[PDB]
Amino acid sequence: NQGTVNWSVEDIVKGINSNNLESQLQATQAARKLLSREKQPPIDNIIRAGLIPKFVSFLGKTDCSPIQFESAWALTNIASGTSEQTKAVVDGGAIPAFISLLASPHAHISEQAVWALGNIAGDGSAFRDLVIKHGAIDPLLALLAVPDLSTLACGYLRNLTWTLSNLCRNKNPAPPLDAVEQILPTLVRLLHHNDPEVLADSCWAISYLTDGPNERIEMVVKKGVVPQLVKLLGATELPIVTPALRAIGNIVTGTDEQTQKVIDAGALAVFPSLLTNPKTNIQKEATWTMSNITAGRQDQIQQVVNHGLVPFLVGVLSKADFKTQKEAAWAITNYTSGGTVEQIVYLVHCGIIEPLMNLLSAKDTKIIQVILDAISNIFQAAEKLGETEKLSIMIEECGGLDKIEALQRHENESVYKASLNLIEKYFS
């Protein structure tokens, strides 16, 4: 660590173009040190000097593992740049050469190749699927075919987990079904590993895989991970809670039967703290998740009631970031749409009406339609009980009616005909 620090690009080129493998090794190391600096590494200058095809061919030098490692690392850092820079590494032929290095006897060369394939896959769906077509999944999973993951070096195991996550990542298209099936059993195993970074990235992979059509949700749910995801939902580390919650929220976008699985695993008991979580994205995600559960069957609405989660929705509707308040309005409008009369009435006893009316002062136009539908649904339930007028006073007493008649002269046709309708019918 003296003679390879801060070389010029031109000296690097001189060394790599010599016919001396040791000179090439030193110049390759010098390139990797240039590309490893934090202030603006000269990725584009390295590419312009035509070094990528040389680095790629150094990957095949089984005879000289240090130059394998140095060029793997240099190419890793190029591939970590822009799409155009990652494309240059791929266009050099790096993908098959990195896959051959997965089997290397040198764990630090293996690991660099894992990392490099993670950067390439991370660029997007096309490179992700190209890494898969070159056959990266089998050698990667083979690196985890040990009796106890604890015997692997922590850094190595985190990197492998991260790279598998990128292979599960991104949409249009989602990853090939066969590849998901190939990776899932290993993901299930990683989801029980004790290291918080492995757990975080495993949850992230599950959250990618569950963010699609219901048959994707089913192949994940079929592996029985929902109880483990619920347990991770209660972790103290927010880097674990955040992807676990998105996975759970993705799963409840599916069928009534998939949604019931997260309820039966005990998720509803975590939502008192999730719906008051100080970190805004957790509260929003948790409320969005609640909104899809209140779009479930009536017996699932009843389990929301039994767990005492309605006052937490009232709480979120009363005070939260506006985007979370918006998810709570959806949760209420979904609840009132599919609930029984008694469930809808319980909503009023809990105090839904005033914070609901206060939100009609939002100028987001979509939420106003969502709130008006909810009120319609609540009046309809009360009129099955002749309470229509006792509810009118409540809406009147909190400034409600003033707000609805104000939107009687609103922009949107769907807004003011519902405001009109409401007053025409329930007030004046």
């Binding site: 590494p41 690392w73 991370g122 992230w204 994205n281 909104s291 779009a295 749409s337």
Partner: peptide
């Protein structure tokens, strides 16, 4: 119907989300 289930709109990249690419600082 009951198809009031609303799919997520958050994309798989960007803030909050894990790094898509990372450089190696050293060994």
């Amino acid at each position: 119907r009951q198809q009031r289930k609303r799919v997520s709109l958050e994309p798989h990249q960007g803030p909050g989300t894990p790094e898509s690419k990372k450089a190696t600082s050293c060994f």
